[PDB]
């Protein structure tokens, strides 16, 4: 089997991407944030505290003839941005782009933190990291990909995120028309539950490539590119007037600037992030200070190849017995 679904930016900045997902019988379609940095499929629901729902579409398990309460199971998750959610668990039929999993754990939110409430465009998350990170207790549950894997034509999914445009998540096949050149594959460590890999270095604009190992995670659920402070300083030093602002929370730059590109290495291959992809617009409405799309990871504990980096590539998440990641230009 295979599946193919379009993923759409939630706003003009590509702050996140939503993909429609069918849950239950008859189908209830929710727009979920596919997140290769976490491993829970959770949704706004008829159980979510009413004051914490503000425009999201909800899953109502009582209206699904295939929903079954997973007795005794609870979940609770905290994300790197400080947001959180928790609740109980149903199993139900879940389909993405024509690919169907029966018995998928659908984590129904009873509580969500303010940032989820305040984003009416995201109805929940669909985790695509390794199932060892799934938070369901006392019986950990599998991700949608893990449940689907055995049925897929090939045990892979691909992320093809658009810049200011829709893109595609495919399951079970590699669309050879969706990228240019060849796909370069690189090793993955699953020890932390992430799609964790080592980039071979970077360049800023037309500058020379610096060969240096940068361990980080391929994370579709993080907006920006978070890299070591040395790398980030080297990038922003090429932008007149750019500075790190403690009050804003990262590097800002004059909105009048033209940003240089940023290249990262995948083995001997190179992925080029155009400068425009690094512009996240005014820090507040009407400001001439703009927020940068490359930021320091120094306060995170891990480097994160988020959407800014991934949207410059066609990315293969290879879930073979020994997982690997593939990157191609496009």
């Amino acid at each position: 089997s295979t599946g193919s679904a379009t993923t759409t930016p939630i706003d003009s900045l590509d702050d996140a991407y939503i993909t429609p997902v069918q849950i239950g019988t008859p189908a209830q379609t929710l727009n979920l944030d596919f997140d290769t940095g976490s491993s829970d499929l959770w949704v706004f629901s008829s159980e979510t505290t009413a004051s914490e729902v503000d425009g999201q579409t909800i899953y109502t398990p009582s209206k699904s003839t295939t929903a079954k309460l997973l007795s005794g199971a609870t979940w609770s998750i905290s994300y790197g941005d400080g947001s959180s959610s928790s609740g109980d668990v149903y199993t139900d039929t879940v389909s993405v782009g024509g690919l169907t999993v029966t018995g998928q754990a659908v984590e129904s939110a009873k509580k969500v933190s303010s940032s989820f409430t305040e984003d009416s465009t995201i109805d929940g998350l669909l985790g695509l990291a390794f199932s060892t990170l799934n938070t369901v207790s006392p019986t950990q549950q599998k991700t949608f990909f893990d449940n689907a894997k055995a049925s897929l034509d090939s045990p892979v999914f691909t992320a093809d995120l658009g810049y200011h445009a829709p893109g595609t998540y495919n399951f079970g096949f590699i669309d050879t028309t969706a990228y240019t050149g060849s796909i370069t594959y690189t090793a993955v460590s699953t020890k932390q539950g992430f799609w964790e890999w080592t980039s071979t270095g970077y360049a800023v604009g037309s500058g020379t490539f610096k060969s240096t190992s940068i361990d980080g995670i391929a994370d579709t659920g993080t907006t920006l590119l978070y890299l070591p402070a040395t790398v980030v300083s080297a990038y922003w030093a090429q932008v007149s007037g750019a500075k790190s602002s403690s009050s804003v929370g990262g590097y800002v730059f004059p909105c009048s600037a033209t940003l240089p590109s940023f290249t990262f290495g995948v083995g001997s291959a190179r992925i080029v992030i155009p400068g425009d992809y690094i512009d996240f617009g005014p820090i507040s409405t009407g400001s001439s200070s703009c927020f940068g799309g490359i930021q320091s990871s120094a306060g995170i504990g891990i480097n994160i190849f988020g959407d800014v980096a991934l949207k410059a590539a066609f990315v293969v998440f290879n879930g073979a017995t020994t997982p690997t990641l593939g990157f191609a230009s496009k």
Side-chain angles (χ1 to χ4, degrees), residues 1-62 64-67 69-109 112-141 143-148 150-190 192-242 244-330:
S1 64
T2 64
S4 182
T6 298
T7 192
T8 302
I10 64 166
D11 63 23
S12 64
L13 296 178
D14 299 346
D15 282 316
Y17 298 78
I18 49 173
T19 308
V21 177
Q22 281 72 48
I23 309 177
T25 309
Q28 301 179 39
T29 297
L30 275 64
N31 296 328
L32 305 186
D33 183 354
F34 282 24
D35 180 13
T36 63
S38 69
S39 305
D40 288 50
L41 191 177
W42 73 261
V43 297
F44 279 79
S45 75
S46 57
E47 302 179 328
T48 310
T49 299
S51 60
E52 298 180 348
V53 184
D54 185 5
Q56 295 80 12
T57 294
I58 63 167
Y59 169 59
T60 302
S62 66
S64 173
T65 58
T66 42
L69 179 70
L70 186 61
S71 182
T74 60
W75 62 279
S76 181
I77 192 162
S78 307
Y79 297 101
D81 66 354
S83 67
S84 64
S85 52
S86 61
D88 56 17
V89 187
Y90 294 82
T91 56
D92 209 341
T93 301
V94 172
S95 299
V96 175
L99 171 65
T100 301
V101 167
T102 56
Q104 174 64 45
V106 176
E107 302 174 32
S108 166
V112 304
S113 67
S114 59
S115 64
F116 287 115
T117 300
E118 290 160 5
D119 182 4
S120 64
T121 72
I122 291 178
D123 302 324
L125 267 64
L126 190 149
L128 294 167
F130 293 89
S131 295
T132 54
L133 295 179
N134 176 266
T135 77
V136 177
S137 181
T139 307
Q140 189 171 62
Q141 301 295 303
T143 70
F144 176 80
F145 178 55
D146 221 335
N147 282 323
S151 301
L152 295 178
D153 291 357
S154 182
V156 307
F157 68 92
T158 66
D160 179 8
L161 302 180
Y163 167 67
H164 292 355
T168 305
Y169 282 101
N170 289 330
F171 291 82
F173 73 105
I174 285 161
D175 179 356
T176 61
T177 75
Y179 57 88
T180 64
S182 56
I183 305 177
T184 296
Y185 288 87
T186 196
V188 164
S189 172
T190 66
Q192 295 190 82
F194 300 123
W195 293 92
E196 187 175 359
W197 66 290
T198 301
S199 171
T200 49
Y202 68 98
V204 175
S206 59
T208 62
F209 187 83
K210 175 70 166 181
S211 293
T212 184
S213 295
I214 305 172
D215 181 289
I217 66 168
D219 184 1
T220 59
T222 289
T223 312
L224 305 186
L225 174 53
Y226 293 89
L227 292 175
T230 48
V231 178
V232 176
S233 183
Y235 178 80
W236 289 108
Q238 297 305 310
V239 180
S240 292
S244 183
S245 167
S246 57
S247 57
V248 174
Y251 279 91
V252 297
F253 67 93
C255 292
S256 59
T258 304
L259 296 178
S261 63
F262 183 88
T263 300
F264 64 96
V266 182
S268 57
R270 306 288 181 254
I271 300 295
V272 180
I273 305 170
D276 287 354
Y277 289 28
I278 300 161
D279 180 6
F280 279 74
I283 60 171
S284 294
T285 304
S287 179
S288 73
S289 182
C290 272
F291 196 68
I294 296 176
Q295 297 293 346
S296 180
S297 64
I300 297 178
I302 198 162
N303 300 306
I304 307 174
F305 293 87
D307 298 333
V308 162
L310 302 182
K311 74 178 71 176
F314 178 87
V315 187
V316 180
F317 294 80
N318 170 27
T321 303
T322 297
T324 65
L325 279 166
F327 292 82
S329 296
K330 64 186 185 191

